[PDB]
C-alpha cells in the first residue's frame, strides 16, 4: 500500500480474520433464506493508514505491529468476489480516533489517521448484479457503512476538504420571502410568529441574518430547548387553568424543600449525602488519601428516544453519554457514581419464538424493528457505561404493541419510536454545588474532543467513551483541588451543540462572549461556520477559567491526554460574537437578548377523553396458561440479557446490583451503592414506571409510577420519606386526541397531590412530546401511538448499606406476609394478564390510600432498621404470582401459599398489579411484624400467604383446592426463555444455550465458599503499627477506570498508593526506580482499540526510555507487579520485558463474543505467586467484568507446557467445584478455567477478575452471612505488604 492520495499517501495493511466461525455460519444461513446461492464466505479486517510523511523500516515495522491484534484465527488466501465495508465516506469512526491515538503515542507522527474496514471474500459467483446488492445489503449498516469493490477504493475515506464559507439570507433585498425560503431550505422549523420576530430584529440592525445566526436561533427557540408545552397556559374543557405543567412540578419543591441543595438551575439536581472519606490522589504528593468530608448526591435522567429508532447503538451510547456529561458538568464539577438504563419498545417477534399476543402491524420502512432496538440498543449504552466506567445497576424493559380500544376510539398503541432512558447518580463536593461567577475576561474553554458534522440520516450519532473518560478525569482533577478548583463554571454540551452551549454559559453568568471560530478543534476542516457552531458532536464540555489559571488547566489536561481549547472571552456587554480567522470576517454579532427573544406564550385549548373500555374476556384465560404466558412477556421475563452486558462492579462501591442470591437471579428491586470506600453510608436508585395504565386512566399511571418507585426502594434503610427525591420523565404524544388533557391531569395528580401529600420532591425532569409514528402500510395510513409514559426514578441517601434486603427467600421457619396496598380492588385492567391476552381490561390498579402508602413506607423503614425481615420483593408486572415466583427463583426453593383471604377471583388475586409486595419474616417474629404493620393502620391490608420450603414445589392453594401447582425449576426456565432466546441471536449460540440448559438442573448448589486461610486475620497489622508505608505505583493509562478502588485496597493493606499516569513516565515526571510495587489497573485503555491492553503495552515497548524503565523494574531482585483486568492484557504483551513469562498465554475475545459482567466462582490453584500465598485451595466468588479475557495458547503443547510448569493461579469452577469450561461458570471460555497466571519466581501475577472491586465484603453481590468487613480477596493486598518486608 502506497498509491497516490492527495497531499498524502494511503497504505493498505492486511489484518486478521473478522467473523468468528459461528457468525460466518449464521451469515450463510441467512443467505440461503433469500435464495442467494452463497457457498463459502471469508471476512478479513483490512487497515488503511493515511501518511503525511514516510516510514523508515523500523517505523514501517512498528506500524505493521500495532495492527496485529485480536484472536489468532486461521488465515485464508483471497478467493471469490471482494466486498469491502468501510464507514461511510466523510466520517471518522471511534475505532479510528482511538486507534490513531495509539499511533501517535508510539512516535508515528507520519500516521495522519488510521481507519479500519472489513473485507468480505464471497463464493457464490452465479448471481445477477441485483442479487449482489442484496448480498451487500446483508454485509453493512446502511446508516453508517458503505460497500466498496476495491481495497484501493478506500482512498475516498481520507479526502481533504476546503473550509466552506458562511452564506447569508437576504432580508433587506428580497424581503420577508427570504426568511421563508431559508426556513425551508435549512429546515429551521420556525413558526409564523417567530419569522415575524426575526424579520423585525434584523431590520432594526440593518444587515442580513447569517444562516448560522438563523440556525442557532431555530435551536434556542425550539420546543425541545425552550420546553414550550411544559410552560404553556392551559385550558381544559373551556375552563382555563391556574398553573402550567412545570409550575405544578415546581410545586413539589415548594412543599418539600428538605435536603435539596440545587434544583431546576443546573444539569442535574443535588441533595444531601453523608460524611464519608472521599478518596483521591493528592495534587502535590501524588498520593491517594481519604478526605473526611461531606459527599453530596446529584441525580439526573435523560431520554434519547428518536435517534434510537434510527440507529440503536449510537442512540443508547449517546444516551448514557449525554447524561454523564450533565452529571460531570453539574455545579462546579462532580463525579458520576452509578447509572440506570431503561427501554420501551414494541413486540419483539423473535423468529421461532413468536408469542400468542404478537401480531405484525407493519412499521415505517425508514426505522428499525423493536427486536433490533433490543439487540443493538442495550449494547450501545452498555458499551458507553463500560468503556467510561460507571456501573448500570437498575432499570426497566417494557414491550407493548396492541390494537387497543383507548381514549380516542380503537387505535394502534405501541413504541415504534422507542423510549431510550439513561440516567444515574454522582457525588459532588459541598463547596461546589453552586456555580461560581464568570468574571469579566474569563477564558471560555471547550473541554472535549474534535468536532465533526453529526447533528435524514443526521440522526445517526457517534460515541467515543474513552474521550469522555479523559475529560472526566480532568473534571475530577479540578474538583479534587478543593478550593483551588479552576472551574469557575462548567456546563455540558448537547442539543444545538455550541450554538446553545456557549451562549447558555455566559448567560448563566450575566455575561456575553466574543468567540473565535478557528480556535475550536475540528476533525473535518471542510465544515461551514454553521456546521462547526451547530454540529452536535459528542464528548464535549464548556467551561470558564480565570486567565491566570490557564497554565494549571493546561498541565492538567495534557497529563490526562484530554484535549481542550480556549475559544473565547467573557464580555461585560451582553453580546455574542463569532470571528472567523480564515475568512477574515464575523459569522455572528448581535445583542444576547436578540437570540433569547420571545413571542406569545403557548396556549393549549384541549378537551378530555376517558376510555370507555370493556371488561376482560376470560375464554382463553386459565390460571395455568396465564402463568405460562405472563412468564413469557418481555416486561416480566428474566432480564439476564441486559444485566450482564454492562459492568456492575467498577468503582468498588456496588453494594447491590441486579443479581441476587447464590444463583445470581436478576431480581433486585433497587440499586444501592456505598458513598465511599471507607463507609456504610450510601445512595439508592429505584425505578417506577407503569405506562400501559395510561390507556385507561392517566392519573393512575402517573400515581402508580411514584408507587412502584417507592415499593421498589422501600427495603433499604433511608429513614424520613423526605430523603427520597424523584425525577419525573414525561413521554407523550402531544397533539394526539385527549392525551393532552390526560397529560395535564396526570401531571397534576403527582405534582400537586400525590407527591406533596407523601412528602416527595421532583427536582429533575425532561420531556418527550412526540411518542407516535406515522407511516404507510397499505394504501391507507397507520399510526403507532404511545401511552402517557411517566418514568419516575427514585434517588435516596442510604443510612446503613448493610441492612438492604433482596428477594432471596430463606428455608428456615418463616412467613410470607403479603401487604396488599390495593385494599382488595384486585384490578386486572392494563396488566400483564390482559396484555398477554390481547386486551386492555376494565379498571386498572391505582394508589388507593395516600396515607397508607406512606404508612407502608414508614412501616417498611421501621422493620429494615430493626432487622425483622428476611426478604423483600414488591409487586408489579405479572402481579403476586410473578413476585412469588421470582422470590422462589432467587432463593432456589419452593413456596406453599394460600390465596383464600384474597377473594374468589383467584385469577385477579394472582395477577392484580396493585401496589404492595411480599415480606418474608422469621417464624418466631410473625406476631410482632403483624402488630407493627397494624400500628400504621395497614392491619387491613396484610394477609398471611404461607411459607417457603426447601424444594421444587411451587404451590398456591385456596383452602382445600390446589389453585396452581408446578415445578419451580420449570417456571424458572420459562421465565428465562425470553433472555435465553435473545442471547442466541446476539451472542454465541453455544453459550446462550449452555447458560439456559444449566438453569434446568435443580441440583445447582449455587455460589458456595471454602477458605484455606483466615480471612479475618490481618497479617498486615504488625507492619501498619510501625507506621512505615511502602510506596506502590498504581499505574494507569488513558482509558483506565478502576485505579481509585485499587489504590484503596493496597492502602488498607498498609501501603502508600501513588498516582502514576503513563504520561507521568513518558513526560519524565516520575521514575519507577523509586517503587518496589507496581500495579497495572483496569479499564478500557484506548477503548480497547488495536486489541485490549495492546496499545497500552506497545506505547511502553516502543519508547526506549520508558521501555528500559519498566524492564529494569521486573529484573530487579526485590519487586512485585500485579495486573488485574485490562492491566492483565497490558502486561501479557510485555512478555519480552518480564522474567519468567515465556509460557504465558494471550488474552482475547470471549467465546460468547460478548462482554461478561458476572460474579463468577474461582478456585485458587498452586503457583509460585507470592500475591496468592496461603490462599491455595480456597474457593470464593469474584468480580468478573471483561470482554477479552479468554486465554489463548498457540496449540496443545503450549497449554500442555504452561499447565505442566504450574504457572496457573486462578481457575473457574462450576458451583459444584470441578474446573469447568462451560459457560458462564467460566465466562470467557479459557481452557481449563484459567484467568490468572504468574511467573516462575511468583513476583509478578496477572489475572482477569477484579480482586480490588470486592475487597470489601459489602461490595460482593452475594456472600456468606457471617463475613466481616473484609472479603477473602483482601488478603492479596495484605500479602504484598507482608512480602515487601
Ligand X SMILES: Nc1ncnc2c1ncn2[C@@H]1O[C@H](COP(=O)(O)OP(=O)(O)NP(=O)(O)O)[C@@H](O)[C@H]1O
1124 C-beta neighbours (distance < 10 Å), count: 25
Asked if residue 319 belongs to a known ligand binding site, the reply is: yes
- 1118 three-state secondary structure: coil
Distance of alpha carbon 718 from alpha carbon 1258, whole angstroms? 17
Work out whether 326 is an interface residue with ligand X (CB under 6 A).
yes
| Binding positions for ligand ADP, 860-899, rule CB under 6 A | 876-877
Q: Of these, 280, 343, 396, 1113, which contacts Mg ion (CB under 5 A)?
A: 396
Asked if residue 14 belongs to a known ligand binding site, the reply is: no
- 887 three-state secondary structure: helix
Residue 54: Cβ-neighbour burial (10 angstroms; 0-12, 13-18, 19+)? exposed
- Report the residue number, 101 or 877, with the smaller CB distance to Mg ion: 877
* Part of the chain binding ligand X (CB under 6 A), chosen from 342-350, 492-500, 1222-1230, 1252-1260: 492-500
* Part of the chain binding ligand X (CB under 6 A), chosen from 93-101, 349-357, 763-771, 808-816: 763-771
Closest C-alpha to 761, from 773, 769, 751, 770: 751
Closest C-alpha to 837, from 618, 1100, 584: 618
Give the CA angle between residues 987, 993, 995 to the nearest 5°: 90
Work out whether 669 is an interface residue with ligand ADP (CB under 6 A).
yes
First CA to last CA across the chain, in angstroms? 56
Distance of alpha carbon 717 from alpha carbon 204, whole angstroms? 62
* Part of the chain binding ligand X (CB under 6 A), chosen from 87-95, 172-180, 265-273, 962-970: 265-273
Q: Count residues near ligand X (CB under 6 A).
A: 18
Closest C-alpha to 1248, from 1167, 1152, 1132, 1142: 1132
* Part of the chain binding ligand ADP (CB under 6 A), chosen from 60-68, 308-316, 639-647, 1047-1055: 639-647
Determine the number of helices (DSSP H) and then strands (DSSP E) in the chain: 37, 52
Work out whether 1155 is an interface residue with ligand ADP (CB under 6 A).
no
Asked if residue 325 belongs to a known ligand binding site, the reply is: yes
Work out whether 230 is an interface residue with ligand X (CB under 6 A).
yes
Residues 1171, 1122: contact at Cβ < 8 Å? yes
Question: Is the dihedral angle over the CA atoms 205, 206, 209, 214 positive or is it negative?
Answer: positive
Binding mask 387-406 for ligand ADP (x = CB under 6 A): -----x-xxxx---------
813 CB contacts (<8 Å, ≥6 apart)?
922, 923, 924, 947
- 493 three-state secondary structure: coil
Work out whether 299 is an interface residue with ligand ADP (CB under 6 A).
no
Distance of alpha carbon 237 from alpha carbon 1216, whole angstroms? 67
Q: Count residues near ligand ADP (CB under 6 A).
A: 18
Work out whether 664 is an interface residue with ligand ADP (CB under 6 A).
no
| Binding positions for ligand X, 1128-1147, rule CB under 6 A | none
Give the CA angle between residues 393, 397, 398 to the nearest 5°: 160
Asked if residue 876 belongs to a known ligand binding site, the reply is: yes
Q: Of these, 343, 889, 936, 1155, which contacts ligand ADP (CB under 6 A)?
A: 343
Q: Of these, 194, 266, 539, 669, which contacts ligand X (CB under 6 A)?
A: 266
Q: How far is the CB of 245 from ligand X (least distance, A)?
A: 7
323 CB contacts (<8 Å, ≥6 apart)?
300, 301, 302, 339, 422, 423, 424
Work out whether 740 is an interface residue with Mg ion (CB under 5 A).
no
Binding mask 699-718 for Mg ion (x = CB under 5 A): -------------x------
Say which entry of Mg ion, ligand ADP, ligand X, none residue 1088 contacts (CB below 5 to 8 A, set by partner kind).
none
CB-side exposure of 1268: number of CA atoms within 13 Å? 9
Provide the grid cell at 601: 406564550
Q: How far is the CB of 630 from Mg ion (least distance, A)?
A: 10
Asked if residue 320 belongs to a known ligand binding site, the reply is: yes
- Report the residue number, 210 or 344, with the smaller CB distance to ligand ADP: 344
Work out whether 658 is an interface residue with ligand ADP (CB under 6 A).
yes
Q: Of these, 246, 288, 1102, 1223, which contacts ligand X (CB under 6 A)?
A: 246
Q: Of these, 17, 307, 342, 496, which contacts ligand ADP (CB under 6 A)?
A: 342
749 CB contacts (<8 Å, ≥6 apart)?
698, 699, 702, 703
Residues 729, 793: contact at Cβ < 8 Å? yes
- Report the residue number, 236 or 832, with the smaller CB distance to ligand ADP: 832
The residues annotated as belonging to the active site are: 1125, 1250, 1252
Residue at grid coordinates 392453594: 957
Length of the chain: 1285
SS3 labels along 268-300: CEEEEEEEEEEEEECCCCCEEEEEEEEEEEEEE
CA distances 827 to 406, 618, 893, Å, are 17, 14, 29
Q: Of these, 41, 317, 329, 341, which contacts ligand ADP (CB under 6 A)?
A: 341
Q: How far is the CB of 492 from ligand X (least distance, A)?
A: 5
Q: How far is the CB of 766 from ligand X (least distance, A)?
A: 6
Distance of alpha carbon 403 from alpha carbon 664, whole angstroms? 37
Provide the grid cell at 268: 442535574
Work out whether 856 is an interface residue with ligand X (CB under 6 A).
no
Distance of alpha carbon 1020 from alpha carbon 1222, whole angstroms? 37
Distance of alpha carbon 376 from alpha carbon 390, whole angstroms? 19
Q: Of these, 347, 649, 804, 876, which contacts Mg ion (CB under 5 A)?
A: 876
Asked if residue 117 belongs to a known ligand binding site, the reply is: no
Provide the grid cell at 756: 406533596
Q: Of these, 669, 697, 846, 1109, which contacts Mg ion (CB under 5 A)?
A: 669
Q: Of these, 11, 492, 898, 1045, which contacts ligand X (CB under 6 A)?
A: 492
Q: Of these, 163, 426, 494, 855, which contacts ligand X (CB under 6 A)?
A: 494
- Report the residue number, 642 or 1081, with the smaller CB distance to ligand ADP: 642
Residues 823, 941: contact at Cβ < 8 Å? yes
Work out whether 155 is an interface residue with Mg ion (CB under 5 A).
no
- Report the residue number, 497 or 917, with the smaller CB distance to ligand ADP: 917
Say which entry of ligand X, Mg ion, ligand ADP, none residue 668 contacts (CB below 5 to 8 A, set by partner kind).
ligand ADP
Distance of alpha carbon 817 from alpha carbon 941, whole angstroms? 10
Q: How far is the CB of 890 from ligand ADP (least distance, A)?
A: 11
Work out whether 358 is an interface residue with ligand ADP (CB under 6 A).
no
Asked if residue 669 belongs to a known ligand binding site, the reply is: yes
Q: How far is the CB of 301 from ligand ADP (least distance, A)?
A: 13
Work out whether 249 is an interface residue with ligand X (CB under 6 A).
yes
* Part of the chain binding ligand ADP (CB under 6 A), chosen from 153-161, 249-257, 636-644, 1104-1112: 636-644
Residues 651, 1044: contact at Cβ < 8 Å? yes
Residue at grid coordinates 455460519: 25
Say which entry of ligand X, Mg ion, ligand ADP, none residue 397 contacts (CB below 5 to 8 A, set by partner kind).
ligand ADP
Work out whether 975 is an interface residue with ligand ADP (CB under 6 A).
no
Compute CA 867 distance to the chain's CA centroid, rounded to the nearest angstrom.
33
Q: Which residues pair with 303 in a beta bridge?
A: 421
Q: Of these, 766, 873, 986, 1158, which contacts ligand X (CB under 6 A)?
A: 766
Asked if residue 311 belongs to a known ligand binding site, the reply is: no
Q: How far is the CB of 225 from ligand X (least distance, A)?
A: 7
Distance of alpha carbon 956 from alpha carbon 899, whole angstroms? 7
Q: How far is the CB of 980 from Mg ion (least distance, A)?
A: 17
Q: Which residues bind ligand X (CB under 6 A)?
A: 227, 230, 246, 249, 264, 266-268, 302, 326, 492, 494-495, 728, 764-767
Query: Which residues of this chain interact with ligand ADP, rule CB under 6 A?
Result: 341-343, 392, 394-397, 639, 642-643, 658, 666, 668-669, 712, 876-877
Annotated binding site for Mg(2+): 669, 708, 712, 874
Q: Which residues are annotated as a binding site?
A: 315-326, 394-396, 668-669, 708, 712, 874, 876
Which chain residues interact with Mg ion by CB under 5 A? 396, 669, 712, 874, 876-877
Amino acid at each position: 500500500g502506497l498509491v497516490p492520495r492527495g497531499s498524502h499517501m494511503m497504505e493498505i495493511l492486511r489484518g486478521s480474520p473478522a467473523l468468528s466461525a459461528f457468525r460466518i455460519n449464521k451469515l450463510l444461513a441467512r443467505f440461503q433464506a433469500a435464495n442467494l446461492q452463497v457457498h463459502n464466505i471469508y471476512a478479513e479486517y483490512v487497515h488503511f493508514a493515511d501518511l503525511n510523511a514516510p516510514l523508515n523500516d523500523s517505523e514501517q515495522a512498528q506500524l505493521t505491529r500495532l495492527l496485529q491484534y485480536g484472536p489468532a484465527l486461521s488465515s485464508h488466501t483471497p478467493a471469490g468476489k471482494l466486498l469491502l465495508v468501510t464507514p461511510r465516506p466523510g466520517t471518522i469512526s471511534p475505532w479510528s480516533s482511538k486507534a490513531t491515538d495509539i499511533a501517535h503515542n508510539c512516535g508515528l507522527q507520519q500516521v495522519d489517521r488510521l481507519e479500519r474496514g472489513v473485507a468480505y471474500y464471497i463464493e457464490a459467483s452465479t448471481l445477477t448484479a441485483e442479487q449482489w446488492r442484496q448480498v451487500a445489503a446483508e454485509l453493512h449498516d446502511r446508516m453508517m457503512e458503505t460497500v466498496f469493490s476495491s481495497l484501493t477504493d478506500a482512498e475516498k475515506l481520507f479526502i481533504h476538504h476546503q473550509p466552506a464559507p458562511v452564506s447569508s439570507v437576504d432580508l433587506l433585498g428580497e424581503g420577508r420571502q427570504a426568511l421563508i425560503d431559508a426556513n425551508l431550505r435549512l429546515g429551521l422549523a420556525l413558526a409564523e410568529d417567530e419569522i415575524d420576530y426575526l424579520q423585525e430584529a434584523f431590520t432594526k440592525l440593518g444587515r442580513n441574518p447569517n444562516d448560522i445566526e438563523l440556525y442557532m436561533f431555530a435551536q434556542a427557540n425550539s420546543e425541545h430547548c425552550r420546553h414550550k408545552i411544559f410552560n404553556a397556559d392551559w385550558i381544559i374543557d373551556g375552563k382555563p387553568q391556574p398553573k402550567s405543567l412545570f409550575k405544578m412540578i415546581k410545586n413539589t419543591f415548594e412543599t418539600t424543600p428538605d435536603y435539596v441543595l440545587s434544583a431546576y438551575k443546573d444539569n442535574a439536581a443535588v441533595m444531601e449525602g453523608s460524611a464519608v472519606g472521599r478518596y483521591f490522589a493528592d495534587h502535590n504528593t501524588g498520593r491517594y488519601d481519604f478526605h473526611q468530608e461531606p459527599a453530596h448526591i446529584l441525580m439526573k435522567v435523560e431520554t434519547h428516544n428518536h435517534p434510537t429508532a434510527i440507529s440503536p447503538w449510537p442512540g443508547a451510547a449517546t444516551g448514557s453519554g449525554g447524561e454523564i456529561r450533565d452529571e460531570g458538568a453539574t455545579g462546579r464539577g462532580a463525579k458520576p457514581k452509578a447509572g440506570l438504563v431503561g427501554f420501551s419498545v414494541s413486540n419483539l417477534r423473535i423468529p421461532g419464538f413468536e408469542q400468542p399476543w404478537e401480531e405484525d402491524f407493519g412499521k415505517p420502512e425508514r426505522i428499525v424493528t423493536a427486536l433490533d432496538i433490543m439487540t443493538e440498543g442495550p449494547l450501545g449504552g452498555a458499551a458507553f457505561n463500560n468503556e467510561f466506567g460507571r456501573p448500570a445497576l437498575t432499570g426497566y424493559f417494557r414491550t407493548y404493541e396492541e390494537k387497543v380500544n383507548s381514549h380516542n376510539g380503537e387505535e394502534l398503541r405501541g413504541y415504534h419510536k422507542p423510549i431510550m432512558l439513561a440516567g444515574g447518580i454522582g457525588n459532588i463536593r459541598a463547596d461546589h454545588v453552586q456555580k461560581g461567577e464568570i468574571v469579566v475576561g474569563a477564558k471560555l474553554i471547550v473541554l472535549g474532543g474534535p468536532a465533526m458534522n453529526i447533528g435524514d440520516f443526521a440522526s445517526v450519532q457517534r460515541d467515543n467513551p474513552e474521550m469522555e473518560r479523559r475529560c472526566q478525569e480532568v473534571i475530577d482533577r479540578c474538583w479534587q483541588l478543593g478550593d483551588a478548583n479552576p472551574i469557575l463554571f462548567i456546563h455540558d454540551v448537547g442539543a444545538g451543540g455550541l450554538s446553545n452551549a456557549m451562549p447558555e454559559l455566559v448567560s448563566d453568568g450575566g455575561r456575553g462572549g466574543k468567540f473565535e471560530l478557528r480556535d475550536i478543534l475540528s476533525d473535518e476542516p471542510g465544515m461551514s461556520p454553521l456546521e462547526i457552531w451547530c454540529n452536535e458532536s459528542q464528548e464535549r464540555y464548556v467551561l470558564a477559567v480565570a486567565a491566570d489559571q490557564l497554565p494549571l488547566f493546561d498541565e492538567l489536561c495534557k497529563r490526562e491526554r484530554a484535549p481542550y481549547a480556549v475559544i473565547g472571552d467573557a464580555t461585560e456587554e451582553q453580546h455574542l460574537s463569532l470571528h472567523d480567522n480564515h475568512f477574515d470576517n464575523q459569522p455572528i454579532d448581535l445583542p444576547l437578548d436578540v437570540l433569547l427573544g420571545k413571542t406569545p406564550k403557548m396556549t393549549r385549548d384541549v378537551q378530555t377523553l376517558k376510555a370507555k373500555g370493556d371488561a376482560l374476556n376470560r375464554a382463553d384465560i386459565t390460571i395455568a396458561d396465564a402463568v405460562k404466558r405472563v412468564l413469557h412477556l418481555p416486561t416480566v421475563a428474566e432480564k439476564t440479557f441486559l444485566v450482564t452486558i454492562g459492568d456492575r462492579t467498577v468503582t468498588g462501591m456496588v453494594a447491590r446490583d441486579q443479581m441476587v442470591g447464590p444463583w445470581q437471579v436478576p431480581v433486585a428491586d433497587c440499586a444501592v451503592t456505598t458513598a465511599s470506600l471507607d463507609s456504610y453510608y450510601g445512595e439508592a436508585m429505584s425505578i417506577g414506571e407503569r405506562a400501559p395504565v395510561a390507556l385507561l386512566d392517566f392519573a393512575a399511571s402517573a400515581r402508580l409510577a411514584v408507587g412502584e418507585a417507592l415499593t421498589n426502594i422501600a427495603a433499604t434503610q433511608i429513614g424520613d420519606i423526605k430523603r427520597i427525591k424523584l425525577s419525573a420523565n414525561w413521554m407523550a404524544a402531544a397533539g394526539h386526541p385527549g392525551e393532552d388533557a390526560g397529560l395535564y391531569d396526570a401531571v397534576k395528580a403527582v405534582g400537586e397531590e400525590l407527591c406533596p401529600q407523601l412528602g416527595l420532591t421532583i427536582p429533575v425532569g425532561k420531556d418527550s412530546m412526540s411518542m407516535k409514528t406515522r407511516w404507510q402500510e397499505g394504501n391507507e395510513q397507520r399510526e403507532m401511538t404511545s401511552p402517557l409514559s411517566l418514568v419516575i426514578s427514585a434517588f435516596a441517601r442510604v443510612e446503613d448499606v448493610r441492612h438492604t434486603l433482596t428477594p432471596q427467600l430463606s428455608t428456615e421457619d418463616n412467613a410470607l406476609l403479603l401487604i396488599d396496598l390495593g385494599k382488595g380492588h384486585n384490578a386486572l385492567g392494563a396488566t400483564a394478564l390482559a396484555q398477554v391476552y390481547r386486551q386492555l381490561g376494565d379498571k386498572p390498579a391505582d394508589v388507593r390510600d395516600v396515607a397508607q402508602l406512606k404508612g407502608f413506607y414508614d412501616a417498611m423503614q421501621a422493620l429494615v432498621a430493626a432487622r425483622k425481615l428476611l426478604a423483600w420483593h414488591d409487586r408489579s408486572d405479572g402481579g403476586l404470582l410473578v413476585t412469588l415466583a421470582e422470590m422462589a427463583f432467587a432463593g432456589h426453593c419452593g413456596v406453599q401459599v394460600d390465596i383464600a383471604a384474597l377473594g374468589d377471583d383467584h385469577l385477579a388475586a394472582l395477577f392484580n398489579e396493585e401496589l404492595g409486595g411480599v415480606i418474608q419474616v422469621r417464624a418466631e417474629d410473625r406476631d410482632a411484624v403483624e402488630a407493627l404493620l397494624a400500628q400504621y393502620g395497614l392491619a387491613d391490608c396484610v394477609h398471611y400467604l404461607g411459607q417457603a420450603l426447601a424444594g421444587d414445589r411451587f404451590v398456591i392453594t385456596a383452602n382445600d383446592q390446589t389453585v396452581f401447582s408446578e415445578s419451580r425449576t420449570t417456571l424458572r426456565v420459562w421465565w428465562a426463555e425470553t433472555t435465553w432466546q435473545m442471547q442466541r441471536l446476539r451472542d454465541n449460540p453455544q453459550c446462550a444455550d449452555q447458560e439456559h440448559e444449566a438453569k434446568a438442573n435443580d441440583t445447582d448448589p449455587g455460589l458456595n465458599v471454602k477458605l484455606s486461610f483466615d480471612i479475618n486475620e490481618d497479617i498486615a497489622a504488625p507492619y501498619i503499627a510501625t507506621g512505615a508505608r511502602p510506596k506502590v505505583a498504581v499505574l494507569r493509562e488513558q482509558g483506565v477506570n478502576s485505579h481509585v478502588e485499587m489504590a484503596a485496597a493496597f492502602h488498607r493493606a498498609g501501603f502508600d498508593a501513588i498516582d502514576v499516569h503513563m504520561s507521568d513516565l513518558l513526560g519524565g515526571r516520575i521514575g519507577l526506580g523509586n517503587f518496589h510495587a507496581l500495579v497495572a489497573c483496569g479499564g478500557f485503555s484506548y477503548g480497547d482499540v488495536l486489541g485490549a491492553g495492546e496499545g497500552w503495552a506497545k506505547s511502553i515497548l516502543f519508547n526506549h526510555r520508558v521501555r528500559d524503565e519498566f524492564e529494569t523494574f521486573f529484573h530487579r531482585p526485590q519487586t512485585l507487579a500485579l495486573g488485574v483486568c485490562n492491566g492483565c492484557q497490558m502486561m501479557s504483551n510485555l512478555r519480552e520485558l518480564i522474567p519468567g513469562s515465556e509460557l504465558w498465554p494471550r488474552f482475547v475475545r470471549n467465546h460468547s463474543d460478548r462482554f461478561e459482567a458476572r460474579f463468577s466462582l474461582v478456585e485458587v490453584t498452586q503457583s509460585p505467586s507470592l500475591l496468592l500465598q496461603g490462599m491455595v485451595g480456597s474457593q470464593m466468588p469474584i468480580a468478573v467484568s471483561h470482554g477479552e479475557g479468554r486465554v489463548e495458547v498457540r496449540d496443545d503443547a503450549h497449554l500442555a507446557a504452561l499447565e505442566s510448569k504450574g504457572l496457573v493461579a486462578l481457575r473457574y469452577v462450576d458451583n459444584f467445584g470441578k474446573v469447568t469450561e462451560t459457560y458462564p461458570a467460566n465466562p470467557n471460555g479459557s481452557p481449563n478455567g484459567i484467568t490468572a497466571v504468574t511467573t516462575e519466581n511468583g513476583r509478578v501475577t496477572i489475572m482477569m477478575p477484579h480482586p480490588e472491586r470486592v475487597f470489601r465484603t459489602v461490595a460482593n453481590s452475594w456472600h456468606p452471612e457471617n463475613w466481616g468487613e473484609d472479603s477473602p480477596w483482601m488478603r492479596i493486598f495484605r500479602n504484598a505488604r507482608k512480602q515487601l518486608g
